[PDB]
Amino acid sequence: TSQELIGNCIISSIYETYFGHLNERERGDMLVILKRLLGKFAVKYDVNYRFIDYLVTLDEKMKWLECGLDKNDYFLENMSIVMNSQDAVPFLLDPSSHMITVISNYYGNKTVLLSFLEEGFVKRLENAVRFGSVVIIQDGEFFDPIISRLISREFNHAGNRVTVEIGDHEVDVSGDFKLFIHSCDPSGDIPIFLRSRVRLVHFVTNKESIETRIFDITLTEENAEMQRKREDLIKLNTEYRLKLKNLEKRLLEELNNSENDELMVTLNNLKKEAMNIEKKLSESEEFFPQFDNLVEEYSIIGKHSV
Amino acid sequence: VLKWIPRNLPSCLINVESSVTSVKLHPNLPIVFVATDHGKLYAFDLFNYTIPLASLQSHTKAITSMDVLFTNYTNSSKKNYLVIVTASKDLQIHVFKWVSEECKFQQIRSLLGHEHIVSAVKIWQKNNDVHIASCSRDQTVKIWDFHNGWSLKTFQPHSQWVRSIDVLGDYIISGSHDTTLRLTHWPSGNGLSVGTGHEFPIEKVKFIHFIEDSPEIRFRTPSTDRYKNWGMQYCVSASRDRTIKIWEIPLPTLMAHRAPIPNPTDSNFRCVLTLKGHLSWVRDISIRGQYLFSCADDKSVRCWDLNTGQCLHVWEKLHTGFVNCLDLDVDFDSNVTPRQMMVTGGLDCKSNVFMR
Amino acid sequence: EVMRPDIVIPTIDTIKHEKIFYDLLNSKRGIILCGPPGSGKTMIMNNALRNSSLYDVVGINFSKDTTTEHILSALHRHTNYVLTLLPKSDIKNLVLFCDEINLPKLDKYGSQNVVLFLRQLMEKQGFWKTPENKWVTIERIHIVGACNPPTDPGRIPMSERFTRHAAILYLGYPSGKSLSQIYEIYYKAIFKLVPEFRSYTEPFARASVHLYNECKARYSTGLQSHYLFSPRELTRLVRGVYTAINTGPRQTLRSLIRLWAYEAWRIFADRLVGVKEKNSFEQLLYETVDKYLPNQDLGNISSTSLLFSGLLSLDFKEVNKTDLVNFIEERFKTFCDEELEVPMVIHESMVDHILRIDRALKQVQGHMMLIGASRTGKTILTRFVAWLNGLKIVQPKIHRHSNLSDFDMILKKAISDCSLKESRTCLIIDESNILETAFLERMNTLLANADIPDLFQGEEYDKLLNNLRNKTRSLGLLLDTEQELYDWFVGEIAKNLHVVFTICDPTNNKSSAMISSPALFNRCIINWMGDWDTKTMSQVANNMVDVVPMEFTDFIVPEVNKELVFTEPIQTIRDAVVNILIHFDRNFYQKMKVGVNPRSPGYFIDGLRALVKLVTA
Ligand SMILES: Nc1ncnc2c1ncn2[C@@H]1O[C@H](COP(=O)(O)OP(=O)(O)O)[C@@H](O)[C@H]1O
Ligand SMILES: Nc1ncnc2c1ncn2[C@@H]1O[C@H](COP(=O)(O)OP(=O)(O)O)[C@@H](O)[C@H]1O
Ligand SMILES: [Mg+2]
């Protein structure tokens, strides 16, 4: 797993920047050509790689699901591609405008709604960047170039405090400030200056997403117990791995030295947990071919639907 | 003996981990202090340069300027020690005390009040009273006293940020980033005159002091009885326009036992002499005898003359990169012995010293 | 004297045209000069009238927004009223200049106004005064014109009712022999500076004329819309060679040829768009030098092998690449310390472009246009080079809810700072900074002329004249008439103001109209930033990835084709990462059907930053 990490980092980093504004089919095709291209240049990647299972832990995944995001994997990886931008200001493009509520839930009361069409926009914006509150912007198709310094992050380190120039006067910023842009027009013309400096993420629904959602509905209604078993086994496998790691930490802390019953009990618990891990892996090994058969069996319904 | 010229080759070599920003001289014993960019403060001996005498971290950011003074307190209880003040980019300056017996640094006090990075510091003594002057990017030329450690006067000479200052008596000259100079009265704060004529920001400025006896100097001797009574004759400035200009000080509306006032018809500097030939920005200047020494960013240091006004000697390729600072010994004060060495520092993490 | 723009070289064609033009003016007939934009109609026009003792010149420049008030103001400065209108001169008949007659726009009902006014003046021999309703009689005032053919995209065809009364002439491009003689005289004048190479006047004139001929013949307007070559480019080449030689060191023949090749690179091929087109230009330069100059010891004369700078010394001489890169890196670190901080990486192409922008900016009345994709480093490079030369950045902060008013204020403030306060300014204009075509017409007026008279009228004009008189008296110059003050002011503006344009997407209609404008395309130097070639991307990736350790796995060297590897031949894993990223970027841009649109490389920098962060974690 360590002769393999640099291939897995490049497939994940390239997933963040280039795949923002592509749908399911183009993402699949480009991921396939990336895997073939990595194979051409002899860098080992993961044949069983999944972007969500590589970067989206179960805790953040559940926290994002409870906020209001749909259970589709595409929206999950797009929420990941948005929230994992520490350097470039992200662009949110959803005609439904459904995830303003989601980001409000994630950031709590700190979420402050603003719009480019407001007249007191600049004053409350400089106030918000002064206190460092998270800012949500609507109607990005009418981008105002007065925030060009914020968009490209052309700050200057004046002393120990970071400083930006907005409007016609010096203003101060704080490290807890984050900015988001939401738009409602999928075909709204955007300046190339804004487009090339943001992370254009498309929260739209095409025919390929129709096929994916039809397949999801068929799995969650036709055979729902097997999908529930998948979710339960994934959760218990993660919990069992965490408990095994905690038991090993207990064993290593039981070195003592400024054998005993506590150390032997810890070793027996580790033995039971490792046996449980082995049994869970053996049971899960013969469970994914059921998914393969279900995919090969529920594709005509998707083709007819599209 | 005052007409000494360093030879064509460096006497010794000094290696530092990072780039050199300031090189000074101990005015009594052969010890060279070398600044860094990582904030480290070094201490080298001329005859033993392999191993530093002391190494200390006192600033989080880069150190820009240094100053070294030896006190002359009239009382025997206050012994004569060495004070080293280093100004850095960490919004703070630190003051060191050198000890001869233990050969180690000791921080005395740190002076705060700057709103931005400080670029220059100068130390002086008029009559049994040590003062520390500094100028920063916040356009505030601040003055401190050593014993109290409190500010005395804060003022802006220029709208754009000041870079380098020099002190003499009750008068402070200050270069700036708005390609102009302005003298200020130290106690009152009134700008006596404003100099203009450079086409680029000023790097370093120092006064040209008088001399007691010399055959013929046309740029250090007094001109009239008014200037003899005043005590300053010329000032020299260096700026990023590849030139060094020596300027006269205009007369103020001076009155006995009163603050000087600017002359409405004579409150403007006059460019006297200019020197050209440097391939890049002149970075630092130092005057000794009748010879004006200046470094530049052309990997070279040049030796100019006050009287005839051209380069007698040149030293190409002194370093791999830019040459940052030069310093000499004070010749106009009888307390400081004008002994013969030259010290330079480069951006290529190397330093060089000149002996004999 | 080659720097001043009022000079000609008398060949057969220009004297022939001057003779027939005196005949046509003396025949009481209007004259229209129609020809290609580089034929020098204005040049020969001003040469014919300025040297004349029988006619006078009045300066009018038509624009899209032009009314008869400008014509009335211009004629009022040279004529008098007695109802009869007569010129101030009693012997010389006034001749009324009208260049770019196609430039005034049609009304709401398909007609123009100023051309009909001129027609009424030249065939009804007068006009009706508007407020007093009186007839005007005009006796010895003639009308001349200079307009391009209407085939180019932006010229409005003119009604035959006006061209009825005016004679028409075609000023074709001068042939090979005439250009050879003219530039022979130019090179004799320019080589009077270095008498040691006086015998090389003829081969250089032949080489310049021939190279211009083939550069016109190969790259036509079909490939790109801005390949409008003209002898103006050759004249500007002569000016560049002069401004290099006059501020250069002791000169040798090899350095002479290298200097000429560098000027040719920076004036003919900087607007080329294709790599194969640049290779064709390089082959053309090779064969031209070989054909007309059998000289040996001539090294590589590509763009990256010809670096002439004034920063590294006191004169315009060739500099070593490594010393140049080190100096640029240290100066840029100082720039980021003193100014806005941006993690810019140094590569050879950016050094080449920063030097060509520095060459453009040091010229008097020097203006340039930058064409390239976004996030290619254009405005930061312009600010950096302006800080190098001591210029002042005046960046117009234009928002959405803007109009002509605030743009007029920022232009007026920039002009006042340039003239009154005597501070050089490097004005930058982005593509998004031009909302409507009115700002474009304001730029046309600013650049085609030396100033904008519309910004100073009435009380503004009076206070501007008062401030100009105050500045002139403060400087100590005996100037009292308004004409001398105005000419000194426009000279100060033309000497101390440089505009640099930033254009992101040239395929847009607004960008197409902006680069198709005649008063903007000819004066500015066209530079094509374009997209990064493979070598530049490889250099940037090698300079960005090496900060984090990659070597912890055994790597086998894969045998692949030579054309598939863009980095230097692979031996480690960092080169594998560089190759994999460049290959993915190229395949992604090919499979998105971007077409001939510029490919913004900001995706590559973002991918590299995310890569280094993720591999560190
Ligand atoms: N016969 C000639 N003699 C000297 N220079 C010429 C001649 N013909 C053309 N030129 C050059 O060509 C350029 C044409 O520029 P310009 O007069 O602006 O063209 P136009 O009048 O078409 O706008 C001039 O700079 C001039 O130096
Ligand atoms: N090697 C590079 N060359 C050019 N630009 C770069 C490079 N690396 C990063 N950049 C990014 O490009 C931006 C500057 O480009 P800029 O000139 O503003 O583009 P534009 O002219 O389209 O506005 C910087 O914010 C920087 O983050
Ligand atoms: Mg023309």
Atom of ligand 2 nearest to the CA of C372: 22
CB contact under 8 A, A158 and B91: no
Contact C61, C99 (CB under 8 A): yes
Closest in B200, B279, B321 to C313, CB measured: B279
Report the sign of the C-alpha dihedral through residues C98, C100, C104, C106, in that order.
positive
Total Cβ atoms within 10 A of residue C38 = 17
Q: Which of residues 156-175 of A touch B (CB under 8 A)?
A: 158-160
Angle between the N-to-C axes of helices A58-67 and A99-107, in degrees from 0 to 180, rounded to the nearest 10: 120
Q: Give backbone dihedrals phi and psi of B349, rounded to 5 degrees, phi first.
A: 60, 30
Contact C540, C574 (CB under 8 A): no
Q: B279 to chain C nearest CA, in Å?
A: 5
Q: Rounded to the nearest whole angstrom, what is the distance from the C-alpha of residue C577 to the centroid of ligand 2?
A: 22
Interface test with B, best of A157, A160, A170 (most B CBs within 10 A): A160
Distance (Å) of CA C113 to CA C66, C107, C135, C445, C517? 9, 8, 19, 20, 22
State how far the Cα of B254 lies from the Cα of B268, in Å rounded to an integer: 15
Please give the helix or strand (H or E) that residue C331 lies within, else none. Answer: helix C321-338
CB contact under 8 A, C607 and A16: yes
Total Cβ atoms within 10 A of residue C240 = 21
Residues with CB in 5 Å of ion ligand 3: C 37
Report the sign of the C-alpha dihedral through residues C231, C236, C242, C244, in that order.
negative
State how far the Cα of A94 lies from the Cα of A181, in Å rounded to an integer: 11
State how far the Cα of A127 lies from the Cα of C597, in Å rounded to an integer: 40
Residues C366-377 as b/e (b if ≥16 CB within 10 A, e otherwise) read: bbbbbbbbbbbb
State how far the Cα of C577 lies from the Cα of C565, in Å rounded to an integer: 11
Task: Answer yes or no: is B133 within a domain.
Answer: yes
Contact B114, B136 (CB under 8 A): yes
Tokens representing B282 are 């002149």
Sole residue written with tokens 């990462």? C577
DSSP per residue, chain A: --SSHHHHHHHHHHHHHGGGG--HHHHHHHHHHHHHHHHHTT----TT--HHHHH--HHHHHHHHHHT--S-HHHHHHHHHHHT-SSSPEEEE-SS--HHHHHHHHHGGG-EEEETT-SSHHHHHHHHHHHT--EEEE-GGG--GGGHHHHHT--EEETTEEEEEETTEEEE--TT--EEEEE--TT----HHHHTTSEEEE----HHHHHHHHHHHHHHHHTHHHHHHHHHHHHHHHHHHHHHHHHHHHHHHTT-----HHHHHHHHHHHHHHHHHHHHHHHHHTTHHHHHHHHHHSSHHHHHH-
Pairing verdict, β B93-98 and B107-111: antiparallel
Residues 6 or more apart in contact with residue B181 via CB below 8 angstroms: B173, B174, B175, B194, B195, B196, B202, B205, B235, B237, B247, B269
Task: Answer yes or no: is B4 within a domain.
Answer: no
User: What 3-state class would DSSP assign to C433?
Assistant: helix
Tokens representing B36 are 């860094």
Pairing verdict, β B56-57 and B107-111: unpaired
Q: Rounded to the nearest whole angstrom, what is the distance from the C-alpha of residue C523 to the centroid of ligand 1?
A: 13
State how far the Cα of A273 lies from the Cα of A244, in Å rounded to an integer: 6
Please give the helix or strand (H or E) that residue C506 lies within, else none. Answer: none
Report the sign of the C-alpha dihedral through residues C448, C451, C454, C458, in that order.
negative
CB contact under 8 A, C553 and A6: yes
State how far the Cα of A81 lies from the Cα of A104, in Å rounded to an integer: 18
- C126 labeled binding residue: no
Tokens representing B313 are 């000697």
- C38 labeled binding residue: yes
User: What 3-state class would DSSP assign to B179?
Assistant: coil
> Residue A155 burial by CB count (10 A; 0-12/13-18/19+): exposed, middle or buried?
middle
Which residues form the domain of B74? 11-356
Please give the helix or strand (H or E) that residue C71 lies within, else none. Answer: helix C68-76
Tokens representing C60 are 């009018």
Q: Rounded to the nearest whole angstrom, what is the distance from the C-alpha of residue C78 to the centroid of ligand 3?
A: 25
User: What 3-state class would DSSP assign to B40?
Assistant: strand
Angle between the N-to-C axes of helices C12-26 and C41-50, in degrees from 0 to 180, rounded to the nearest 10: 60
Residues of A in contact with B117 (CB under 8 A): 159
C377 CB near ligand 2 (under 6 Å) = yes
Residue type for B167, please?
V
Total Cβ atoms within 10 A of residue C559 = 6
Q: Rounded to the nearest whole angstrom, what is the distance from the C-alpha of residue C601 to the centroid of ligand 2?
A: 9
Contact C169, C31 (CB under 8 A): yes
Residues of B in contact with C326 (CB under 8 A): 321
Task: Answer yes or no: is B2 within a domain.
Answer: no
H-type helices in C138-252, by residue range?
160-163, 176-191, 201-218, 231-245
Which of C15, C43, C522 for mutating ligand 1's site (highest number of atoms within 8 Å of CB)?
C43
Residues 6 or more apart in contact with residue C268 via CB below 8 angstroms: C211, C212, C215, C229, C233, C237, C281
Q: Smallest Cα–Cα separation from B347: which of B297, B281, B290?
A: B297
Bridge partners of C370?
Answer: C502, C527
Tokens representing C373 are 């994709």
Total Cβ atoms within 10 A of residue C533 = 12
Residues of C in contact with A193 (CB under 8 A): 374, 430-432, 504
Q: Rounded to the nearest whole angstrom, what is the distance from the C-alpha of residue C381 to the centroid of ligand 3?
A: 32
User: What 3-state class would DSSP assign to B120?
Assistant: strand
Contact C1, C7 (CB under 8 A): yes
Q: Is A169 on the interface with C (CB under 8 A)?
A: no
Q: How much helix, strand and coil, in percent to the nearest 5, is found in chain C? A: 50, 10, 40
CB contact under 8 A, B200 and C313: no
State how far the Cα of C154 lies from the Cα of C106, in Å rounded to an integer: 12
Residues C409-439 as b/e (b if ≥16 CB within 10 A, e otherwise) read: ebbeebbebbbeeeebbbbbbbbbbbbeeeb
Contact C259, C241 (CB under 8 A): yes
State how far the Cα of A286 lies from the Cα of B3, in Å rounded to an integer: 95
Task: Answer yes or no: is B23 within a domain.
Answer: yes
Sole residue written with tokens 């962060």? C613
Total Cβ atoms within 10 A of residue C121 = 21
State how far the Cα of A187 lies from the Cα of A110, in Å rounded to an integer: 30
User: What 3-state class would DSSP assign to C267?
Assistant: helix
Atom of ligand 1 nearest to the CA of C14: 1
State how far the Cα of B134 lies from the Cα of B163, in Å rounded to an integer: 9
Q: List gaps in chain C by the residue before each (C–N > 2.5 Å).
A: 82
Residues 6 or more apart in contact with residue C281 via CB below 8 angstroms: C215, C268, C269, C272
Task: Answer yes or no: is B5 within a domain.
Answer: no
Contact C358, C385 (CB under 8 A): yes
C345 CB near ligand 2 (under 6 Å) = yes
Task: Answer yes or no: is B308 within a domain.
Answer: yes
Contact B276, B310 (CB under 8 A): no
User: What 3-state class would DSSP assign to C255?
Assistant: helix
Atom of ligand 2 nearest to the CA of C380: 17
Distance (Å) of CA C189 to CA A116, C206, C275, C315? 60, 16, 36, 21
Contact C500, C427 (CB under 8 A): yes
Q: Smallest Cα–Cα separation from B346: which of B63, B7, B18?
A: B18
- DSSP state at residue C135: B
Q: Is B60 on the interface with A (CB under 8 A)?
A: no
C225 φ/ψ sector (left φ>0, alpha ψ -120 to 50, else beta):
alpha
Sole residue written with tokens 């903007």? C520
Distance (Å) of CA C259 to CA B266, C254, C256? 49, 9, 5
Q: Please give the torsion angle defined by the CA atoms of residues A256, A262, A264 and A266, in that order, rounded to the nearest 10 degrees.
A: -90
Report the sign of the C-alpha dihedral through residues C47, C48, C52, C57, in that order.
negative
State how far the Cα of B331 lies from the Cα of B333, in Å rounded to an integer: 6
DSSP per residue, C349-406: HHHHHHHHHHHHHHSTT--EEEEE-TTSSSHHHHHHHHHHTT--EE-----SS--HHH
DSSP per residue, C173-186: PP-HHHHHHHHHHH
CB contact under 8 A, A17 and C400: no
Q: Smallest Cα–Cα separation from B117: which of B95, B97, B145, B87?
A: B87
Contact C20, C13 (CB under 8 A): no
Tokens representing B140 are 């505030």
Query: Domains in chain B: how many in total?
Result: 1
Task: Answer yes or no: is B3 within a domain.
Answer: no
Q: Give backbone dihedrals phi and psi of C447, rounded to 5 degrees, phi first.
A: -90, -40
State how far the Cα of B13 lies from the Cα of B46, in Å rounded to an integer: 9
C344 CB near ligand 2 (under 6 Å) = yes
Residue of C nearest to B200 (CA): C390
Q: Smallest Cα–Cα separation from B217: which of B292, B312, B301?
A: B292
Distance (Å) of CA C352 to CA B32, C459, C502, C542, C604? 42, 48, 18, 19, 21
Task: Answer yes or no: is B6 within a domain.
Answer: no
- DSSP state at residue C199: G
> Residue C546 burial by CB count (10 A; 0-12/13-18/19+): exposed, middle or buried?
exposed
Contact B83, B130 (CB under 8 A): yes
State how far the Cα of A148 lies from the Cα of C379, in Å rounded to an integer: 12
Total Cβ atoms within 10 A of residue C556 = 6
CB contact under 8 A, C587 and A116: no
